[PDB]
Design a protein around this nucleic acid. Structure first.
Lengths: 209, 56, 120, 14, 62, 122, 114
RNA sequence: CGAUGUCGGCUCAUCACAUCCUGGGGCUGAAGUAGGUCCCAAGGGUAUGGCUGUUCGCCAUUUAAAGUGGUACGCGAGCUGGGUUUAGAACGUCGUGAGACAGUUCGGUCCCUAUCUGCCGUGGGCGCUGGAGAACUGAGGGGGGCUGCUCCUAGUACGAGAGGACCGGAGUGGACGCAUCACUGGUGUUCGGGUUGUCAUGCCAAUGGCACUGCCCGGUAGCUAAAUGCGGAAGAGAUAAGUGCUGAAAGCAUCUAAGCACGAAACUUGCCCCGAGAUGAGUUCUCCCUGACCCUUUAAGGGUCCUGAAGGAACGUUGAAGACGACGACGUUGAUAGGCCGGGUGUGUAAGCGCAGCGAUGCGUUGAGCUAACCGGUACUAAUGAACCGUGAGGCUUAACCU
RNA sequence: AAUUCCUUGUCGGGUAAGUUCCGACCUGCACGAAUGGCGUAAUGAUGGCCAGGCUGUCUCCACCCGAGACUCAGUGAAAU
RNA sequence: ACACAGGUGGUCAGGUAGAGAAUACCAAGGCGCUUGAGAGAACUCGGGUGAAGGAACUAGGCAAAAUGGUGCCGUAACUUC
RNA sequence: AGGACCGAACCGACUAAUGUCGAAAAAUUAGCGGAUGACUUGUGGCUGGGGGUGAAAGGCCAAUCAAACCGGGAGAUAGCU
């Protein structure tokens, strides 16, 4: 089925009765109401695009205000889109709560990774740092050789070098569900998820069933 | 470090194409005096938001 | 990558940085308005406001903690007697920043940092 | 220049 | 490749030959001259001499 | 955390005093051992009345670590010294008849029964 | 946040005995030996307390037979059952990591008796 | 020969299969396991120490394996200089001698601030044509694809006994990569405390400056792993080796000549990421622009007044975003940054006062005081009213639709 | 052996494992008694090896403090 | 060759602590060394710390780390005593 | 008394790093060896080019040494570029 958009608010741990304390992440889930239902008659694929949160009525633009008045729902932050799985059909404006997570056992969380910035080769691609003594001059944390010789004459595309680390769209898969709370509107997941406290998280059902 | 051959006037111009400085062109008008000043900056006489904030 | 860190380095070690923050906070208490670069004023907002916060309540030990900073008797004498009963009603935010062009020596962002005063 | 120095001690290759 | 000294040829050319005779366990190491063949002939002569000596020693012990 | 060239004290009274871990057995390219993993040791110091002499290369099992072992509740058990029990290289069956110092609960699995049977604590 | 604090305050137990670091604290902890559920004892000297609310823990250093055994314990975990202070130690330092190198006569500390 | 720095080592790898293992099979002098040989298959992995400068080799112990080669028998404008080839000196040999020795050994300065291609990232202009805000489909490209041990099947088949299956399922491991501080740690020169030598505040007390943060002890938040989860797949299509069905040429036989059904970590998917600059420039939703004139080479022409629309840009507050750009939140209709209150955490009974002691010092007020980067609030201060860019509904041809 | 090609000649010790080292075996290519031999207390920024402590050398790097590297204002090269 | 981290002989030379002209802080006296302001990326230098091992790294304990002062006890082989 | 020991001034450069179109055509940083004698240094002289000098490297002789620099034979010579 479809996934839901949530906010990461810290991490905690759940003490089970037998003794095992499991580290959990508190993903709060707001009213993921449906903004538009795309069909095959106009796009060639069936999907639903939704939103979450709540914007103030000074930041939302008139194109976004008209797109939200097309659905009639309250203006919320961001827009996401989930493909349908041919077994269900959603209407425009349906308040989808966390009750869809009550039946599933494992989920997949996709989030914007925490930006590490312009990182080196050792931090990014886990290269071995060379020996810091026995005559080492100006060659401590450099990657060293990046190509062979005259006969290739170039560096191969896909070379593991220093550069941008973080701000990616990484996905930690196969995360166990712990507790689905409807009164507090929470979603406790097992393990760690990408992103810091306050980032958006796409929590979809596990494709590796 | 050492070059093979010198670049052109065209290469120098296409390099200095992004060296063009940008002017602000957003000089404001004070409420009381009306003197020209920048955004979030006081005037030459010390006027800011109409109030004499420098007292000097 | 300084995620959730505060404290500007200002291209100086901690001894010189603390010493010039001491001297500049003393000058701002003594003269009530000074003119300096903008990040020094931004960090001096984190220095002068705890001094006034300590100067909210006059006692025996508060004079010694206000003498532990600024290293001067005239600065703590102007504290607790003149700034104390005059900033009594306002709670926090006693300072004010005024951006004033750029310096002609090195093109640095200039700023008058002052208190909410000079109605004498 | 007045003085032009002795060049760099080169690679052996002997 | 060979150990010792002498020239560039020691770096790139091999000039060192080790021959092991499997059912007897006799190892012959030659690092004498420059070309391999002139060392292959010496290594085969030393193989023949050591095998003949090890067989005649067993015959004289028997 | 027991890796190569690590000096360990002998837990039982088999005879050795100081041993040196030469390889963490089980799985290639492995850094260090765990709770009750098998390591290969050499003997650096032994008593005159020991059943093994100085220089015997044999298998052992780590029982106490300075890095600490982690119970699944969230706690850690750190010991003030590394310790091992010597094993006879094809069937484990430890040499010493008395074992000093406590052990960890995760060592109890189907083959180290004599060690936890001779354990005075835990 | 209020969400994290509300999720933590519903799980913290309200009968935690207050003890300063340095007290001779005896802790009885559950353990599952397969088909058995045994309450075992552990008596030692507290050398560190890390208060984190629900995530709070405390060390109990014990000099057992042979060498010392250091073992942390989570305060609000269900695996522990009882915390009883036997002696009230009178150290003036929060952490007691310097007691690790000291064995025997130099390991004991002062009693409060205030 | 008006200069191509080579051996070995460290880091970084790329490619071929004449395949070391994993995988699918045929023969066997294959009862089972363990084997010998051979075909297809390069998707992944392919040691740790002593010696030697050594590649290599031997030894010790693992592993499923310790593959062969190419890339200037890779890689010094990435790094040493141990060895080989500068200048010193010696041992042995030759030469009357100066000197010589691929016969060692002792020791001996290895430069360069990146113009071009390439690679890792990140931006500006313009285009897609009326513009803008978003949401995606998706061409194509990239990342990964390793497997041990134990148990059930099952001591089952097989086997006189010893030994011991194939296939399938589950759990726990090692490496790799990703994610995060929930636990444990490290750092935490912005927090607290102890102490030495000196100086200063007119002196005691107290505090501050210097001596590597003076020496240390811890330690908030962030970063980080040694800490904790995750994954290599399941499934589908087309196949290589190989096993086949029907079946003539050639009354038989035949996997192939017509056809059909199987068949691998190899290929494409399926797992994840980038991505319409894919100039072939895609699709959907929404917002906004409906004012007159003269000149005329009546051209998809230029110029004048009025309006600036949606939106963007500039400035400031700034960020678990960031070299700079860029991205995200906010700008008084406010919780974006700083300050303040309370809580939490950390250091640990501040100063003053009172008591005991000749004194150092000890106790009570007090588990106080101080709290950085944390949390929940609070406009107390700073984000001003405005100015700038972007416009009068949008070209030609053809067909279907309403007039 | 500063000597030695064959050679990592052979034995023992040190290490789990030692072409280095030590004590010898003499089969001295090609040691040798003033171009001196054998030992030798003390000494050496001397060559090699081993033992204890000690540690980021390494396993395996992680964080922090200042000086550069990044941006802005002023002056402003060079090899080629 | 420079308003250059180099070199240049002799005299005076204090307080505290210190065996001392060493070293730490000061008096008399001279200076802040003729580019500053931001941000706190990869990488480079001088450093500090670090769980567990303690040389497994490397040609090589190279570099770093560690010992270090006064009084007292005691100090082996060998020797030219 | 010691061509004695540790260790400042002073003398020299053994290791590693910074530099290596450097602060400088040999330097600096952190460790070093001697430091009452075969020590160091100032001042003023003497020894000089097929020579001087050398606790001996074929080193040094004005940043140039298996035969210094300056001027002249000399526009030497060059089957060589």
């Amino acid at each position: 089925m479809i996934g839901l958009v949530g906010k990461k608010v810290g991490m905690t741990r759940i003490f089970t009765e037998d003794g095992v304390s499991i580290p959990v992440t508190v993903i709060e889930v707001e009213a993921n109401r449906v903004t538009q239902v795309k069909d095959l008659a106009n796009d060639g694929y069936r999907a639903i695009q939704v939103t979450t949160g709540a914007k103030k009525a000074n930041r939302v633009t008139k194109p976004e205000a008209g797109h939200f008045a097309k659905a009639g729902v309250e203006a919320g932050r961001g827009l996401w889109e989930f493909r349908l799985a041919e077994g269900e059909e959603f209407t425009v404006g349906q308040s989808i709560s966390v009750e869809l997570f009550a039946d599933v056992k494992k989920v997949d969380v996709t989030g914007t990774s925490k930006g590490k910035g312009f990182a080196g080769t050792v931090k990014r691609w886990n290269f071995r740092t060379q020996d810091a003594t026995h005559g080492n001059s100006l060659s401590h944390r450099v990657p060293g050789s990046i190509g062979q010789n005259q006969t290739p004459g170039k560096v191969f595309k896909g070379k593991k070098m220093a550069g941008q680390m973080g701000n990616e769209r990484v996905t930690v898969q196969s995360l166990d569900v712990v507790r689905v709370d409807a009164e507090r509107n929470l979603l406790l997941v097992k393990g760690a998820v990408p992103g810091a406290t306050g980032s958006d998280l796409i929590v979809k059902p596990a494709v590796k069933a | 470090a050492v070059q093979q051959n010198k670049p052109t006037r065209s290469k120098r111009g296409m390099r200095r194409s992004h060296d063009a400085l940008t002017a602000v062109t957003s000089l404001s008008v004070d409420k009381t005096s009306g003197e020209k000043h920048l955004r979030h900056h006081i005037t030459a006489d010390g006027y800011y938001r109409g109030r004499k904030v420098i007292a000097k | 990558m300084r995620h959730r860190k505060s404290g500007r380095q200002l291209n100086r070690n901690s001894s010189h940085r603390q010493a010039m923050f001491r001297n500049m906070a003393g000058s701002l208490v003594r003269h009530e308005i000074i003119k300096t670069t903008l990040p020094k004023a931004k960090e001096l907002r984190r220095v002068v406001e705890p001094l006034i916060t300590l100067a909210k309540t006059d006692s025996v030990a508060n004079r010694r903690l206000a003498f532990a900073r600024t290293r001067d008797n005239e600065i703590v004498a102007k504290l607790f007697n003149e700034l104390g009963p005059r900033f009594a009603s306002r709670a926090g935010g006693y300072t004010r920043i005024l951006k004033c062009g750029f310096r002609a020596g090195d093109n640095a962002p200039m700023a008058y940092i002052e208190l909410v005063d000079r109605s004498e | 220049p007045v003085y032009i120095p002795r060049p760099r001690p080169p690679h052996p290759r002997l | 490749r060979s150990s010792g000294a002498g020239a560039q040829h020691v770096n790139t050319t091999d000039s060192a030959i080790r021959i092991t005779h499997l059912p007897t366990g006799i190892v012959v190491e030659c690092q004498d001259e420059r070309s391999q063949h002139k060392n292959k002939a010496k290594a085969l002569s030393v193989l023949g001499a050591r095998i003949h000596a090890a067989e005649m020693a067993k015959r004289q012990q028997a | 955390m027991i890796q190569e060239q690590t000096m360990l004290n002998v837990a039982d009274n088999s005879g050795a005093r100081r041993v040196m871990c030469i390889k963490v057995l089980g799985g290639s390219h492995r850094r260090y051992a765990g709770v009750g993993d098998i390591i290969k040791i050499t003997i650096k110091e032994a008593i005159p009345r020991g059943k093994v002499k100085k220089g015997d290369v044999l298998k052992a099992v780590v029982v106490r670590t300075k890095k600490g072992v982690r119970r699944p509740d969230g706690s850690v058990i750190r010991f003030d010294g590394n310790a091992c029990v010597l094993l006879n290289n094809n069937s484990e069956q430890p040499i010493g008849t008395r074992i000093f110092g406590p052990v960890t609960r995760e060592l109890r699995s189907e083959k180290f029964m004599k060690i936890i049977s001779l354990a005075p604590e835990v | 946040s209020n969400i994290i604090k509300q999720l933590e305050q519903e799980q913290m137990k309200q009968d935690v005995p207050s003890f300063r670091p340095g007290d001779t604290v005896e802790v009885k902890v559950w353990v599952v030996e397969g088909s058995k559920k045994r309450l075992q004892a552990f008596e030692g000297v507290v050398i560190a307390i890390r208060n984190r609310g629900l995530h709070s823990a405390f060390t109990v250093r014990k000099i057992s037979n042979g060498e010392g055994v250091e073992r942390v314990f989570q305060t609000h975990s269900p695996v522990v059952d009882s915390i009883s202070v036997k002696r009230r130690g009178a150290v003036r330092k929060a952490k007691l990591y310097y007691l690790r190198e000291r064995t025997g006569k130099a390991a004991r500390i002062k009693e409060r008796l205030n």
